[PDB]
Amino acid sequence: RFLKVKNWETDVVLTDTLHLKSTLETGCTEHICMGSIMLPSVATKDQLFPLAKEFLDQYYSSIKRFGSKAHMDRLEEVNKEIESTSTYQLKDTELIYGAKHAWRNASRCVGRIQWSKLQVFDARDCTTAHGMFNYICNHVKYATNKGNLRSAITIFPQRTDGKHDFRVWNSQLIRYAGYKQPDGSTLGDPANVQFTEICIQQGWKAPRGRFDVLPLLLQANGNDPELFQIPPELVLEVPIRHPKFDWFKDLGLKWYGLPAVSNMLLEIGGLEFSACPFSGWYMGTEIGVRDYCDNSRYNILEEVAKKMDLDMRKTSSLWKDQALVEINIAVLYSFQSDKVTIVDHHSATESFIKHMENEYRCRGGCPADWVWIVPPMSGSITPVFHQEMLNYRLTPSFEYQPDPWNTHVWK
Amino acid sequence: RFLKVKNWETDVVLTDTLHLKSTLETGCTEHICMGSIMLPSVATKDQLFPLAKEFLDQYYSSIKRFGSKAHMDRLEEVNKEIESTSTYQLKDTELIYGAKHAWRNASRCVGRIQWSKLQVFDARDCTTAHGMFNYICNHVKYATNKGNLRSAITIFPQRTDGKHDFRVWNSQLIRYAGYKQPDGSTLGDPANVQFTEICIQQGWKAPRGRFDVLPLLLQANGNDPELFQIPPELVLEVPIRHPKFDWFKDLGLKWYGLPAVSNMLLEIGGLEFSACPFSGWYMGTEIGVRDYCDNSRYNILEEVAKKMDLDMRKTSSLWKDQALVEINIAVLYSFQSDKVTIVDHHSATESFIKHMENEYRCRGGCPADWVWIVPPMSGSITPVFHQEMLNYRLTPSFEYQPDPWNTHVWK
Ligand code: HEM
Ligand code: HEM
Ligand SMILES: N=C(Nc1cccc(CCNCc2cccc(NC(=N)c3ccco3)c2)c1)c1ccco1
Ligand SMILES: N=C(Nc1cccc(CCNCc2cccc(NC(=N)c3ccco3)c2)c1)c1ccco1
Ligand SMILES: C[C@H](O)[C@H](O)[C@H]1CNc2nc(N)[nH]c(=O)c2N1
Ligand SMILES: C[C@H](O)[C@H](O)[C@H]1CNc2nc(N)[nH]c(=O)c2N1
Ligand SMILES: [Zn+2]
């Protein structure tokens, strides 16, 4: 009931009581552990007040006014509005708290040392897909900041009935397009080949190349979604070169500065924000390892090993490992030479251990998903490999949600 | 009740019913997942017959004589001997089945495609620490096989009362010594600094260098353990050189061929074999990444990066990643040039996916611990990163047990 986690590199031991405040379930039982399953899985008015009271009780327990008059009146005020409308509305202050703590509680996020430096843009007055486009452009501009990236989230009107949801249909606001070929192979990004076809099915004229920024598909208050093209001056991009290999320029790769994830669901005191694009910056390995070297992604280990002139006959020459290190040296180098914010897996994983120490001390714990925290290269030479982590679900939280082209009633 | 696991690189989906036959617990609950905790945690006669019947029922269900006359007589025969002695004895055939399936069920082992090619040495007639030494030498010789390594296990008398346990006190039969210095730093292997002091406390004269093979500490039928030195001709060793960097010889590193783990507990039909050293061969990363580059181990990223002439000022130059790839190219290269069996993390992790497919088909599943299956470098460029794995505990099994110098009543 007061579990211990250990670091098997420093022998540092931390004690977790926060997990007791945990609410939702994990997927594991006493007889099976599902910690490596990828995907871990209308709200009546009855259910809504406990969640509202729970959230409000921790919000006032955080500004050091827990149970005071201002708390009990806001507790009754929300009670009365849930009676009235069977739902309710968050103060601007409650929206910033919730949003910031959804991130704080994201157990798969290695960058949470930043969780309280987050810029919350309230788009709950938005009503049209054009207004969404506007808010999203102002998000991209603000968060990019000439390469000095700043974390931000734009929060669109909460779900109400279920048939009038605001959704961004892009998985990320900025994403490269994918096109299959006559021979079957894939130009651009193979991850987005279906979404790219949806945008074309809706009128996008594709500039069928590799690094084509996709248009925004925006669904407002349940209406069929509409295409908008981000002004290209707002899409900052980093051409990838190596500090040694001048043919690495000839490789002709480039990535975008701003990772801005738009397909998730933000849960605050029982309320559901189905459109809530959030952005920070990249850990280097997301691009260098996964985007560039996942077999089903850009898959450049073949080509980089060729230009490096490597023993590509034997699996056991570690030519794959060799070309992967250089690819991530280049991504880091390129981003830093252009003054565009990026973080390497060593700096990022060190900061998380330091972040973990702060959470166990001033909060009683820190939910963490080892399968996701440990970087996808060089696992054990980073300090998170050697750190035991307790995973549990706290709220406010970010959740997965189905893609809207399977849910939506079309016209 | 019939769960699905997916590979997010091939979209291959396998269905697991084996987990229903699971017995022991995992440490996870519906509200916390402990899949990254390192350590996952006398037997009365009442408890012993269910475990005996369970094991025997699956042993006869495996030779296609489930419930026949030979089964029911052996079921009654063991029933009667557990009445008699409150314990019982395994046939030689039952010992090989159990031992082989303990390995088959080891969810953290990536090499289990070999589980049925295992040589079982029955040392249940052993009575003295000298006889243990003898059996263990014959194990090392047989399993080494002039570098053409062969998997084997030597099984010493089962626990009975608890105060008369057979134990090997070495963590592995072959291990390098560790000595701390006046200034505090550590010669040899820092992992074994305490055990090395125990052997010296018992009379070992240390040849205080790096790669000093430790003597065997053997405890027989509960008696105080006794030192024996493996004949050096039986300890095969691989000097580590690089196929490019001739100063890598001057680094002067070497490892032993045979990984033979001696500190675990083999559980078969409720019986407990506290001494059961088992051996196979190395995946390359155990040595190249963990043994050589764990901060608390040999820790040679400093020195290899120096000789490579690297940017060692910035964390973000990936000089650590760079020196780690070369170190594992050398370990592989050295082992293969000497005809000593080793496997690279790519070949080994591919075989496990192929092994997984066989288990889900002819067995209904395959318990697997992702945190341990994914190699400690280059995670996602190997196919196990992208493979969902269900972890659950089946029996027969290998278990951890406390170090005997904390348990034992000394004289
Ligand atoms: C400050 C810079 C940030 C960095 C360096 C960072 C880094 C990462 C990385 C590498 C992942 C793993 C995801 C993957 O590999 O696909 C992740 C997950 C995640 N992050 Fe952070 N992140 C940052 C900011 C944020 C912000 C601002 C939020 C929310 C407001 C957030 C919420 C999440 C969530 C919800 C997930 C994982 C959910 C999932 O896909 O299961 N992150 N982060
Ligand atoms: C055939 C060659 C084998 C290879 C290549 C191999 C590979 C591995 C590796 C890399 C690990 C991870 C352990 C670590 O990183 O510390 C492991 C775990 C394990 N293997 Fe295998 N292994 C082999 C044979 C065997 C045999 C013959 C047995 C038993 C008879 C066995 C039982 C286990 C157990 C019990 C564990 C992990 C238990 C733990 O420490 O939690 N293995 N194996
Ligand atoms: N579909 C596949 N995998 C997959 C499936 C479902 C989900 C996922 C994981 C996709 N989360 C993307 C994501 C979420 C959060 C943060 C970041 N990053 C950041 N820095 C960032 C953005 C904003 C602030 O910070 C990236 C992956 C697949 C097929 C083959 C290989 O993979
Ligand atoms: N004490 C630490 N970690 C730690 C603690 C407890 C347990 C462990 C894990 C130690 N299993 C060793 C092991 C078990 C089984 C197989 C192999 N290998 C083989 N190929 C092999 C041998 C026979 C057949 O196959 C290696 C590690 C520590 C401190 C700092 C960094 O780590
Ligand atoms: C099957 C497995 O759960 C899947 O590959 C996970 C593993 N860990 C991950 N970790 C991160 N950060 N991102 C990922 O996409 C994944 N994928
Ligand atoms: C804290 C964490 O559980 C620990 O580092 C584990 C992670 N996975 C591992 N995987 C293997 N194969 N060997 C290990 O020693 C470990 N250590
Ligand atoms: Zn679990």
Per CB-CB distance under 8 Å, the chain A contacts of B35 are 28, 33, 35-36, 370-371, 391
Fill in the amino acid letter for A174.
I
* DSSP 8-state symbol, A226: E
Other C-beta atoms lying within 10 Å of the C-beta of residue A128 = 13
Q: Are A179 and A193 in contact (CB under 8 A)?
A: yes
Residue B82's alpha-carbon distances to B46, B55, B58, B320, B407, in angstroms, are 9, 14, 19, 57, 27
The dihedral built from the CA positions of residue B34, B40, B46 and B48, taken in this order, carries a sign that is: positive
Q: How far is the CA of A364 from the centre of ligand 5 (A)?
A: 27
Active site residues of A: 109, 112, 281, 286
Tokens of B344: 């690279």
- Nearest by CB to residue A29, choosing from B28, B315, B332, is B28
Q: Do B380 and A347 touch (CB under 8 A)?
A: no
In sequence order, the β-bridge partners of residue A5 are A14
Identify which of B212, B198, B188 has the alpha carbon closest to the alpha carbon of residue B291.
Answer: B188
Tokens of A46: 């009855």
Nearest 5°: the CA angle B27, B32, B35 is: 50
Tokens of B197: 């002091």
Tokens of B130: 């000298």
Q: What are phi and psi of B135, to 5 degrees?
A: -55, -40
Nearest CA in chain A to B1: A32
Looking at the CA of A260, name the nearest ligand. 3
Experimental method: X-ray
- Strands A13-16 and A271-273, by their bridges, are unpaired
Q: Do A324 and B381 touch (CB under 8 A)?
A: yes
Q: Is A156 annotated for ligand binding? A: no
Radius of gyration of chain B (CA): 23
Measure the CA dihedral B126/B132/B133/B136, to 10°: 110
In sequence order, the β-bridge partners of residue A109 are none
E strand spans, A152-307: 152-155, 167-168, 178-180, 186-188, 216-219, 226-228, 237-239, 254-256, 260-261, 265-268, 271-273, 278-279, 282-283
Q: Is the CB of A387 under 6 A from ligand 6?
A: yes
Q: Is B256 annotated for ligand binding? A: no
Return the residue matching tokens 């709220």. Answer: A395
**What number does the ligand 6 atom closest to the CA of B37 have?**
3
The structural domains of chain A, ordered by start, are: 16-124+151-161+265-279+349-373 (3.90.340.10), 125-150+165-236+400-404 (3.90.440.10), 237-259+282-347 (3.90.1230.10)
Residue B344's alpha-carbon distances to A323, B192, B281, B285, B374, in angstroms, are 16, 26, 11, 7, 13
Radius of gyration of chain A (CA): 23
Entry resolution (Å): 2.0
Other C-beta atoms lying within 10 Å of the C-beta of residue A289 = 27
Identify which of B236, B235, B233, B238 has the alpha carbon closest to the alpha carbon of residue B338.
Answer: B238
Q: Cα–Cα distance between A221 and A49 in angstroms, integer?
A: 24
Q: What are phi and psi of A357, to 5 degrees?
A: -65, -40
Q: Is the CB of B280 under 6 A from ligand 2?
A: yes
Identify which of B347, B365, B200 has the alpha carbon closest to the alpha carbon of residue B281.
Answer: B347
In sequence order, the β-bridge partners of residue A228 are A216
Q: Do B38 and A6 touch (CB under 8 A)?
A: yes
CB-based burial of residue B161 (10 Å sphere; 0-12 exposed, 13-18 middle, 19+ buried)? exposed
Site residues for ligand 3, CB cut-off 6 Å: A 38, 259-261, 278-280, 282, 286, 294, 296; B 8-9, 386
Looking at the CA of A372, name the nearest ligand. 5
Q: Cα–Cα distance between A405 and A197 in angstroms, integer?
A: 12
Return the residue matching tokens 């130009």. Answer: A187
- Nearest by CB to residue A31, choosing from B26, B290, B317, is B26
Burial A90-103 (b: 16+ CB within 10 A, else e): beeebbbbbbbbbb
Tokens of A381: 């030479």
Q: Do B344 and A29 touch (CB under 8 A)?
A: no
Across the A/B interface, how many CB contacts are shorter than 8 Å?
201
Mutation choice for B interface testing from A321, A322, A354 by most B CBs within 10 A:
A321
Q: Cα–Cα distance between B173 and A260 in angstroms, integer?
A: 52
Preceding amide of B157 cis, omega within 30 = no
Question: What is the number of residues in chain A?
Answer: 411
